[PDB]
Write a protein that binds this ligand. Sequence first.
Ligand code: UP3
Length: 250
Amino acid sequence: TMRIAYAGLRRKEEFKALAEKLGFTPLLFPVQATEKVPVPEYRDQVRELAQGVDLFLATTGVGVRDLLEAGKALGLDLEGPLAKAFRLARGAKAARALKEAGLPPHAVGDGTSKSLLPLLPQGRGVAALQLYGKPLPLLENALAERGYRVLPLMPYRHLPDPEGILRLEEAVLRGEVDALAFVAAIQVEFLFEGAKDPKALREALNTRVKALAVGRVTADALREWGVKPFYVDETERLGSLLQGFKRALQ
Ligand SMILES: O=C(O)CCC1=C(CC(=O)O)c2cc3[nH]c(cc4nc(cc5[nH]c(cc1n2)c(CC(=O)O)c5CCC(=O)O)C(CCC(=O)O)=C4CC(=O)O)c(CC(=O)O)c3CCC(=O)O
C-alpha cells in the first residue's frame, strides 16, 4: 504494498519511518507551503486589543500563547484588557492556555467553531478573535450577526503549495497512491481549492483512493467536499492512524 501519501508538512520524516515499519510505501506530498506570510496590520490590531475589547475569542492554545508573547514584544499590557473581556475558548487547548495565563474562559466549546454559536452573547462593541494562520468566516459572520465589530488577530497566513497540490492531484488520479492521509482540515481545503479537477478528485477519493483522517475536524472537512473518509482516527495521533488503518484495511 500500500502506497500511502501524506499531505502533512511537520511530521513527514516521522510518518515515513513508521509507515515503512508497518509495511507501507510512504509518499510525501505536502499541500502547504513552508513559508508563512505575516499579516501587515497585525501589530496595529494587537495595539487595538490593548485598548480594551468586549469579547475575546480564543481558538488555539498555541495561538493564545503567541498572542501574549506578541503583546510582550510590543511592550503592551494585554492581560488587563483580556481580564475585563468576556472570554470564549473554542476548545480545551485554547481553554488550558487561557487558564495558565490567569485568564480562564467564561465559555468553552467542543473544539469546533460551530460549538461556539450557542455560546455567543448578543451585544455591541468589539469582539477580538484570536487566529493564527487561517480566517474563520462562520464565526466572524456569526459575531457580526450578534452585533459586534470583529477585530481579527491573525499574525500569519498559511499558504498552499500550488504545484505540490497539482502533483498530489495527478498522483491520486493516475493511480500512484492507494491511500491519502490528511492531518489537518486545512490540508483538505488546500487540496480541493487547488485541484484542477475537483470533481474527478472527489470521485477518486470516494472509489479508488482511501482518504484517511486524523481527527474529527479533518474528517468533517473531507465530508464538506463530498468525500467519505475510509478511516478516521479520533485518537488524533499520526501513529495511531497508521496502526488503526492497517487493521481497517484487512
Ligand atoms: O503536525 C502537526 O502538528 C499536526 C498536523 C497539524 C497541521 C499541519 C501540519 O503541521 O502538518 C496544522 C496546521 C495548523 N497549524 C496551526 C497553528 C499551530 N498549531 C500548532 C500545534 C498543533 N498542531 C495541530 C494539528 C495541526 N495543525 C494541533 C491540533 C489542533 O489544531 O487542535 C496543534 C495544537 C493546537 C493548539 O495549541 O490549540 C502549532 C505549533 C507547531 C510547532 O511549533 O511544532 C502551530 C503554529 C505553527 O504552525 O508552527 C493551525 C491553527 C490556526 O492557524 O488557527 C493549523 C490549522 C489546523 C487545521 O486546519 O485543522
